[PDB]
Amino acid sequence: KLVFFA
């Protein structure tokens, strides 16, 4: 599972 927030 990847979660990226920028």
Side-chain angles (χ1 to χ4, degrees):
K1 170 161 70 174
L2 174 72
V3 187
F4 172 84
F5 190 86

